[PDB]
Design an enzyme around this catalytic site. Structure first.
Site, PDB file in Angstrom:
ATOM      1  N   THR A  64      -3.055   5.741  -6.234  1.00 44.90           N
ATOM      2  CA  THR A  64      -2.324   6.764  -5.495  1.00 44.90           C
ATOM      3  C   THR A  64      -0.824   6.660  -5.732  1.00 44.90           C
ATOM      4  O   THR A  64      -0.110   7.665  -5.627  1.00 44.90           O
ATOM      5  CB  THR A  64      -2.630   6.660  -4.001  1.00 44.90           C
ATOM      6  OG1 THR A  64      -2.259   5.361  -3.523  1.00 44.90           O
ATOM      7  CG2 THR A  64      -4.113   6.885  -3.745  1.00 44.90           C
ATOM      8  N   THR A  65      -0.328   5.463  -6.048  1.00 47.13           N
ATOM      9  CA  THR A  65       1.092   5.303  -6.335  1.00 47.13           C
ATOM     10  C   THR A  65       1.459   5.945  -7.668  1.00 47.13           C
ATOM     11  O   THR A  65       2.510   6.586  -7.787  1.00 47.13           O
ATOM     12  CB  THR A  65       1.465   3.820  -6.331  1.00 47.13           C
ATOM     13  OG1 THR A  65       1.189   3.260  -5.042  1.00 47.13           O
ATOM     14  CG2 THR A  65       2.941   3.637  -6.650  1.00 47.13           C
ATOM     15  N   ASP A 101       0.833  -1.194   0.000  1.00 44.35           N
ATOM     16  CA  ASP A 101       0.000   0.000   0.000  1.00 44.35           C
ATOM     17  C   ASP A 101       0.872   1.250   0.000  1.00 44.35           C
ATOM     18  O   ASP A 101       1.738   1.417   0.864  1.00 44.35           O
ATOM     19  CB  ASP A 101      -0.927  -0.006   1.216  1.00 44.35           C
ATOM     20  CG  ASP A 101      -1.935   1.132   1.195  1.00 44.35           C
ATOM     21  OD1 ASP A 101      -1.982   1.882   0.197  1.00 44.35           O
ATOM     22  OD2 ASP A 101      -2.685   1.275   2.183  1.00 44.35           O
ATOM     23  N   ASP A 134     -11.404  -0.288  -1.615  1.00 43.62           N
ATOM     24  CA  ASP A 134     -10.957   0.598  -2.683  1.00 43.62           C
ATOM     25  C   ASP A 134     -11.388   0.096  -4.056  1.00 43.62           C
ATOM     26  O   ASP A 134     -11.545   0.899  -4.982  1.00 43.62           O
ATOM     27  CB  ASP A 134      -9.436   0.755  -2.636  1.00 43.62           C
ATOM     28  CG  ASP A 134      -8.970   1.534  -1.422  1.00 43.62           C
ATOM     29  OD1 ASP A 134      -9.808   2.210  -0.790  1.00 43.62           O
ATOM     30  OD2 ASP A 134      -7.766   1.468  -1.098  1.00 43.62           O
TER      31      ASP A 134
END
Lengths: 518, 480, 489, 502
Positions: free
Chosen positions: D74-75, D41, D368
């Site tokens: 998000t990465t 994560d 998610d």
């Protein structure tokens, strides 16, 4: 001695060099770390000088410069320090030539008053003749200062908020504008396009009961809407720290049950005596107080800040009554309508207290989709309230943004040869000091500051002495006169004044004695 | 790469730091200690750069600028170094503003060319037909010399010698046309201008030498009279070939290897009354081949009558141990306006400084012949150009407009340095001259101080390429 | 790998400032410090500076052969060769592509650059008067970056009219360079009469008519009271050789070695000019101009071709006797006499003029020209990206890197001139990208104007050798993965 | 600028291996060394690692906003923002470009990137069965990089059929996540019965028919109405028991007012006192305890209950109902599965993991994944991912670069190479050659015929539609937006000033 006039100029240029890149619509932002751990980002020099903590007395003079500049004007606070730094750089080269510091100070004073007379002849009038023409140029004037902020997205719609707010708080005969009359307000969540202007005070409050009416009816043609502000709740009195009341026998147990039960309606009947609708108090109410006021359509608000109570008493002509025995009909608030309006899907559900007649104060309403967006929109509109204040006070205005500094610099170099004095060296330095502003702005726009300065000087000779726009504003071309870009004259006059007077006081100090701390 | 250019500017500006102190007759002297241990002192700017033994090559270019300044104008070698350091000092701030040195070099091209046209506007054209203007110009220019009294009589004598090269149509005017020769004996006020070449050597001192001849032929002979390496027969056959051509005057080149002419050959030529002048330096060989129009003769087989010259009278005049030999009556079509000036004096230190004093007087006149017109000096042309360029800077465009303002400010060092070296207040004098500058232009005329235009012209021209060639060097690498 | 890249960039970093007329000059210094000179020539800077990197000597040796082939643009070849190796660093560290694949990528990229100049080559065969203007524009580009750039406007017609008088082989032995001190550079003139500064004879007539020039090589000095019989015997033996010269019917005699007085004195009574001290370079020039021959056999006349010249006149200029011939056979040859201020200026103008005439010599056989001033490198940069539509995986970044190396030449050129290399080069690509390719980078005003109106053009053969040799030289240094130096003796 | 540019790259270099299904996991270790946990994560890595760089803290708060809207991708936002800053060093230093021009260059480049995704967005309104397959392929990309990728083939229809049962607002409060130890991951199933992890009552019948769900909030421990203000003062223990009887005496009248509602099921937020819990059994009322704020909001979206703060009358209120309440025993804990609700919009997904560490990573993985599928109901347009999305947008950047100014030319062209940096790292984490493989795709996408894209499995170039790799249009437009605004904030800061801490 020699080290006095050296380190003072070098330390002043190093501190002022930080805000040089931050002056403009394209000026770079900064990261100011608060001691509590919160990070703030702003491009204005007023917050930077206040956040910077240092023991050098030379840089503290620049901090005090923006202090009096913000309260008096609040616009050129960032540029007044950069302009003062240009006078220190030109004076350093004059010291090595053997010129006395007072001769440099007297040269900037005579050149300041001479540049004002040349700029005073080129000003134009706006509010003169048709009055609608004033609001035409005023609507597009606020859009220029909003281009450096996220407000520039919707700025077309947001330009009407600052224009209509100053009109209600100002009369054409009085021409008085106070920043205390406009209360700063913002809310997080929703969209920014929903921000409107309210003619009275607007807070964010939540009712203690869901079934309370969200709208206050006039109740068969009453006089306004009576609102009572008291410091004590209506309920059986209870201590706010610890209770601990021991009852020995059933005698006093049955008495307190009957007493407190009768005190429920006696505290509510005080509202019917004064004839008030909305009751605002500092402390909450019991469950019976919410049930009795529900059938009478009398909404109540709990946990209201002390500072918010002063704004309501000014707009609604109310008073702060300490107890329930001192209330009267002359201390009740006066307003046309009170209603709770829902904004989008937000669960806040604020309340709107309207007026429908001209008051002496207004309350702005600003919305935002994020924390930092709200704080940025409040400061962006705060400077807009300072621009509209100087425009209505003086109808004479002059252009700005790098055009005025080039025009004012040409008149100084011409009169320098006619004086035939010692200050002639300071006159050419004062002309080059004014040329620092358009060169500093050009560095933030990605253009050659030397080529841009020469371009502004060449186009003002064979064409006309009128101001010519600069590419730093990110518009299509130069000549801001067609784009209706107007800056206040009194704001620029006080900017070149305090900056020149500050450079004089720096040369008047030949010794700096720094001792320990207690 | 800027570390090389920054070091070249600082090292070059450090040169002119001591030069500003020696500017003017009231300037401050500078001490120089040679590597051999000799201690010398003087106010001459060209002398300082000669014995300085500069190491860094970029700073050595200032020596060539001062050398070309004296080789053409002859005056202003101290001011041209200060003017170069002023442009380098202003160019240092140009690099801090983000200006590339190529634009700096290209901006000096239009700045130097337009300065010449402006300089001609303020110049007052004169005429070479007026002798009163040339005498007072050379006489007042000698006020920098120890003896003022004998400097007045030498002014008209130096002007009359230039009147031959003063002809209207001309191209190359060289100072080698007037040969200055110093002699022991006599005074300074006694000077004679010879219409023909005059050497520095005497005649045969042995018995039989005629030392004087009328209607003689003179030519350059590179041969050497020596026994073959019977001996008198070989020396006689050399003299027989000269007698057939009827050469009355012989010239032998000076050679330190062996003897020039044997004494036995001198006695043989004494009967024929043939004058021989030995110890002829190589510098005088090129001087005789021009005016006389002769040709150098290497061997005895190359000696002919057509390669010789013509002289009406050749005599040796001895006044107080002079024994000078003069040549008159060239009467040749190849002859040019060659002038010979004889310098007389008692002590050796007299004829030395007096001769060197006349060279500077001929350089000032040479400036008027090449470029006509004169301008009163004392900082007048420097302030006039600096003010006009300030108004023209507002009419320019681009990066150059900022350079025109800095180029005009670099010219203010000349009036500032002269005010400092004279003891007067720097700021007080400069602001006072610029105050009246709005009305008066060139107003120093009553003090008879006149600076020739070529000095101010060459100062801008030489400093234009000098400063240019400096900033154009981005690095220095060892190459062997 | 690091020593070859840094070693090649260090060589390119020296001459990177000498490219273009607005470039900068490099200063050199030796241990004596009195030999310091200022010159921008890449051939002088690279050969003089010693280097401890043997890989850097390979690029210098390749530039020596290229300098003799053309003479102009040698600096541009050295810089372009360094740009290909400098961009190879990103082709390794952040790419990781095989070096031989990158070498093969340069071959496919160089083929697109050669076809770009071919399709853009425009020549006009008709109206030779307009072709003369093209040679004027080429001559102005060769005189750039050199001290001759002052008067190059007047020197444009000097070199243009000189080459037009050849009409024949490209050999440069028909042009002689003479440098005399004094006078301005603009005072130089063009003379086809073979000006020679070597005076011959003691007493000779300054003008002679109906003279015949003949070249001969022989020793008239030595053979092979008692000495008188040996000296007179040598004169009688050489008298028969002079009798054969009189049978030639020539009024002028030229000998490579010296000439004794007796054979020279006999030439006076016979009306023959005695010329001596003719070097080896003069013999090759007099053979192709006056139409002479060595004539190594004196045993009988009429074994060789005879020359003819109408008038041999002696003129006096620069304080030295000169020889000006008039009315010779095949007067197509010319001689350029330059007047410099000092010997230091003469050394820079000589080689600059020799390299300028070398390019104009190839313009006679090659009439195709291209537009210069940074426009040539921009057109070839798009042709490389056009061929990128069909490419392999590892060859994609190798060919793409070649297009960006072509724009490094105008980028460095704009930095040497002082202008903005980011603004001018980027705006130049937009107009040339789609249609209407005319304008190019201007080094004077600072904007982008038409190179055709300003008169800036380049030769097709000159620009072809720059892209070719640099692409081949870059593949040699990149291919070498190891350097082995033996024990120095 | 040196600390902000290099410092931001070091932050992006830590999480660069966590992007893509072939990526690698980053290990963290504290001083105690017993808190080490292996997780991919990106939000956990950035928030846990302390940083003294003030410029690096800007991307931390921005990543929190991106995680709240979707929770994935998000990465890629941090890596894309780091590639723009890495290439900016070459644009500033050696390319002679003003930093504000670079900021304005991304503004013109962002408009071309959004236009490329608009023309490439294709949706099918007809044949909803084909739209269901698109939701299956999108769910496969969200479950990537996680341990669930093993059973993801079986999990594809689990998340797809779950979203189709909503038919309403995109709010995620309808789907409740329950995690019980034991059994394989493939044993998870979809249930709309609203499984509850808490039981009701002490001893009460499990099966309840015709129950009426009523949400109420009251204090059952010492319950007194308007009796407050009096304490218990006794001089003996026996006298205290007389006052304690008033607790139940006043409670009996309180239960009588509640019993008039006629409900078979009672719900309270707080606990329940002993005596009324037994009294509710005789009256047939079943009380529920340990009901948090999240559980009340889920019940209001099904039965439509209310807080019900007025117990003074059976009317002027809204009550819910349910047909059957069945109690089941699974995983050694009582569960409650409701049945027969009124238009139930809520679903329940029960994941069965092997260990608690596996369940911790599966929680945010499923939450998610369903957040992205919920946004696909409003926007049906999808795009081709797997490295093909960034390749198509690179063409639109060079297309607008044809006509551009001088200073903005190199700034926009650098954005085109930054788009190819995302698939470049994906090929390095998979083990393939990013140089050769990515360059082969650009040749085909250059002129027309853009279908196939990079494949991380077989190592060849295959069609993303045939392999079932697609992406949502709403997800990509948010990445290009937030990442562009995140890079502009760091480019506008040339200096940092920190106040003296106390």
């Amino acid at each position: 001695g020699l080290e006095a006039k050296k380190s003072h100029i070098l330390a002043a240029r190093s501190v002022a060099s930080i805000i040089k890149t931050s002056l403009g619509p394209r000026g770079l932002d900064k990261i100011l770390i608060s001691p509590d751990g919160e990070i703030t980002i702003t491009n204005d020099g007023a917050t930077i000088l206040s956040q910077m903590e240092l023991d050098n007395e030379i840089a503290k003079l620049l901090v005090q410069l923006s202090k009096s500049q913000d309260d008096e004007i609040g616009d050129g606070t960032t540029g007044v320090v950069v302009l003062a730094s240009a006078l220190l750089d030109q004076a350093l080269e004059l010291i090595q030539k053997g010129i006395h510091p007072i001769k440099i100070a007297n040269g900037f004073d005579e050149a300041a008053k001479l540049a004002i007379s040349k700029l005073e002849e080129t000003c134009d009038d706006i509010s003169a003749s048709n009055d609608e023409l004033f609001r035409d140029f005023l609507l597009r004037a606020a859009k220029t200062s909003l281009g450096s902020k996220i407000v520039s997205k919707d700025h077309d719609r947001f330009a009407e908020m600052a224009v209509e707010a100053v009109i209600n708080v100002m009369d054409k005969d009085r021409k008085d504008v106070d920043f205390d009359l406009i209360k700063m307000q913002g809310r997080v969540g929703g969209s920014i396009s929903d921000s409107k202007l309210i003619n009275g005070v607007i807070l964010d409050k939540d009712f203690s009961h869901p079934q309370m009416p969200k709208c206050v009816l006039p109740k068969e043609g009453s006089d306004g809407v009576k609102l009572a502000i008291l410091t004590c709740p209506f309920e059986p009195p209870k201590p706010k720290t610890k209770h601990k009341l021991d009852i020995s026998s059933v005698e006093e147990y049955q008495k307190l049950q009957t007493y407190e039960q009768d005190k429920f309606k006696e505290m509510i009947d005080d509202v019917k005596k004064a004839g008030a609708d909305v009751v605002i108090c500092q402390w909450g109410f019991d469950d019976e107080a919410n049930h009795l006021l529900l059938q009478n359509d009398l909404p109540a608000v709990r946990w209201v800040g002390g500072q918010e109570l002063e704004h309501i008493a000014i707009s609604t002509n109310g008073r702060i009554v300490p107890r329930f025995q001192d209330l009267s009909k002359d201390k009740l608030g006066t307003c046309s309508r009170i209603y709770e309006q829902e904004f989008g899907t937000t669960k806040d559900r604020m309340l709107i207290i309207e007026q429908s007649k001209e008051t002496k104060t207004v309350t702005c309403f600003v919305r935002g989709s994020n924390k930092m967006i709200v704080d940025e929109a409040e400061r962006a509109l705060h400077d807009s309230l300072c621009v509209v204040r100087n425009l209505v006070k003086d109808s004479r205005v002059v252009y700005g943004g790098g055009a005025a500094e080039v025009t004012m610099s040409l008149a100084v170099s011409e009169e320098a040869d006619k004086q035939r004095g010692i200050d002639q060296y300071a006159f050419r330095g004062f002309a080059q000091a004014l040329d620092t502003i358009p060169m500093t702005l050009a560095e933030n726009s990605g253009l050659d500051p030397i080529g841009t300065l020469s371009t502004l000087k060449s186009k003002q000779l064979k064409e006309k002495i009128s101001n010519i726009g600069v590419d730093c504003l990110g518009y299509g071309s130069n000549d801001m006169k067609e784009l209706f870009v107007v800056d206040p004259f009194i704001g620029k006059k006080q900017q070149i004044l305090l900056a020149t007077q500050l450079c004089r006081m720096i040369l008047k100090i030949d010794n700096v004695i720094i001792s320990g701390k207690d | 790469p800027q570390e090389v250019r920054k070091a070249n500017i600082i090292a070059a500006r450090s040169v002119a730091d001591a030069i500003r102190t020696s500017l003017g007759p009231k300037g401050m002297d500078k001490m120089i200690k040679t590597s051999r241990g000799e201690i010398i002192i003087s106010n001459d700017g060209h002398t300082i750069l000669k014995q300085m033994a500069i190491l860094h090559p970029v700073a050595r270019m200032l020596v060539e600028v001062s050398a070309a300044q004296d080789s053409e104008a002859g005056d202003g070698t101290t001011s041209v170094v200060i003017l170069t350091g002023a442009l380098l000092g202003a160019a240092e701030r140009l690099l801090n503003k983000g200006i590339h040195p190529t634009i700096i070099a290209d901006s000096f091209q239009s700045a130097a060319k337009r300065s010449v046209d402006i300089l001609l506007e303020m110049c007052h054209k004169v005429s070479l037909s007026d002798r009163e203007q040339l005498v007072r110009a050379a006489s007042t220019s000698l006020s920098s010399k120890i003896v003022s009294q004998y400097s007045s009589f030498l002014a008209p004598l130096a002007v009359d010698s230039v009147l031959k090269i003063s002809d209207e149509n001309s191209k190359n005017v060289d100072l080698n046309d007037i040969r200055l020769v110093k002699k022991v004996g006599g005074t300074i006020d006694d000077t004679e201008m010879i219409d023909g070449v005059v050497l520095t050597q005497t005649a045969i001192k042995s018995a039989g030498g005629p030392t004087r001849k009328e209607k003689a032929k003179i030519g350059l002979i590179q041969f050497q009279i020596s026994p073959p390496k019977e001996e008198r027969a070989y020396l006689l056959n050399i003299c027989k070939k000269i007698k057939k051509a009827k050469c009355n005057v012989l010239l032998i080149q000076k050679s330190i290897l062996r003897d020039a002419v044997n004494d036995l050959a001198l006695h043989f030529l004494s009967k024929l009354n043939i004058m021989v002048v030995k110890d002829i330096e190589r510098e005088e060989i090129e001087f005789l081949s021009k005016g006389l129009g002769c040709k150098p003769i290497a061997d005895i087989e190359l000696f002919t009558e057509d390669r010789l010259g013509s002289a009406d009278l050749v005599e040796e005049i001895d006044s107080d141990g002079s024994k000078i030999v003069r040549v008159t009556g060239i009467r040749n079509n190849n002859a040019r306006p060659t002038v010979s000036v004889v310098i007389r004096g008692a002590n050796n230190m007299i004829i030395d400084e007096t001769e060197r004093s006349l060279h500077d007087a001929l350089c000032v006149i040479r400036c008027l012949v090449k470029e006509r017109g004169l301008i009163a000096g004392g900082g007048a042309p420097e302030i006039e150009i600096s003010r006009r360029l300030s108004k023209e800077a507002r009419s320019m465009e681009g990066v150059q407009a900022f350079i025109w303002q800095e180029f005009a400010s670099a010219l203010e060092v000349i009036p500032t340095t002269l005010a400092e070296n004279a003891g007067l207040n720097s700021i007080k004098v400069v602001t006072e001259l610029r105050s009246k500058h709005e009305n008066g232009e060139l107003n120093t005329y009553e003090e008879h101080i006149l600076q020739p235009v070529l000095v101010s012209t060459s100062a801008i021209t030489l400093a234009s390429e000098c400063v240019k060639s400096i900033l154009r060097i981005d690095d220095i690498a060892f190459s062997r | 790998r690091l020593s070859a890249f840094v070693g090649a960039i260090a060589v390119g970093d020296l001459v990177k400032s000498t490219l273009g007329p607005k470039g900068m000059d490099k200063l050199l210094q030796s241990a004596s410090s009195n030999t310091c000179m200022v010159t921008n020539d890449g051939a002088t800077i690279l050969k003089s500076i010693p280097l401890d990197n043997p890989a850097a000597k390979v690029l210098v040796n390749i530039s020596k052969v290229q300098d003799d082939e053309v003479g102009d643009g040698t600096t541009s070849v050295t810089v372009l060769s360094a740009e290909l190796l400098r961009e190879a660093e990103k082709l390794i560290d952040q790419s990781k592509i095989h070096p031989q694949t990158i070498i093969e990528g340069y071959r496919l990229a160089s083929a697109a650059a050669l076809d770009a100049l071919t399709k853009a080559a425009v020549d006009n065969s008709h109206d030779k008067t307009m072709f003369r203007e093209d040679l004027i524009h080429i001559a102005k580009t060769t005189l750039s970056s050199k001290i001759l750039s002052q008067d190059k406007d007047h020197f444009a017609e000097l070199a243009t009219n000189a080459i037009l008088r050849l009409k024949g082989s490209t050999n440069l032995e028909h042009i002689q360079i003479i440098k005399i001190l004094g006078g301005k550079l603009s005072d130089s003139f063009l003379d086809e009469g073979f000006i020679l500064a070597k005076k011959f004879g003691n007493n000779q007539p300054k003008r002679i008519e109906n003279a015949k020039i003949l070249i001969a090589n022989t020793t008239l000095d030595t053979d092979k009271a008692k000495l008188a019989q040996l000296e007179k015997a040598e004169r009688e033996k050489m008298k028969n050789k002079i009798a054969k010269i009189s049978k030639f019917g020539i009024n002028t005699f030229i000998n490579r070695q010296l000439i004794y007085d007796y054979p020279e004195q006999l030439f006076t009574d016979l009306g023959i000019n005695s010329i001596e001290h003719a070097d080896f370079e003069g013999v090759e020039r007099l053979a192709l101009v006056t139409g002479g021959e060595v004539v190594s056999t004196f045993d009988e006349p009429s074994k060789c071709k005879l020359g003819e010249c109408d008038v041999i006149e002696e003129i006096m200029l620069g304080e030295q006797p000169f020889l000006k011939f008039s009315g010779c056979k095949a007067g197509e040859a010319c001689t350029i006499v330059l007047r410099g201020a000092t010997d230091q200026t003469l050394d820079e103008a000589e080689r600059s003029l020799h390299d300028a005439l070398s390019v104009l010599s190839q313009t006679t056989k090659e009439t195709r020209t291209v537009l210069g001033g940074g426009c040539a490198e921009m057109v070839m940069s798009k042709a490389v990206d056009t061929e990128a539509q069909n490419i392999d995986g590892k060859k994609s970044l190798a060919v793409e890197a070649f297009a960006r190396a072509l724009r490094q030449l105008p980028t460095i050129l704009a930095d040497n001139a002082g202008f903005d290399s980011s603004e001018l080069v980027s705006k130049l690509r937009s107009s040339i990208y789609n249609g209407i390719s005319t304008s190019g980078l201007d080094l004077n005003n600072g904007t982008i104007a038409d190179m055709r109106q300003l008169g800036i053009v380049e030769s097709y053969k000159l620009k072809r050798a720059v892209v070719s040799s640099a692409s081949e030289a870059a593949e040699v240094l990149l291919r070498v993965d190891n350097i082995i130096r033996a024990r120095p003796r």
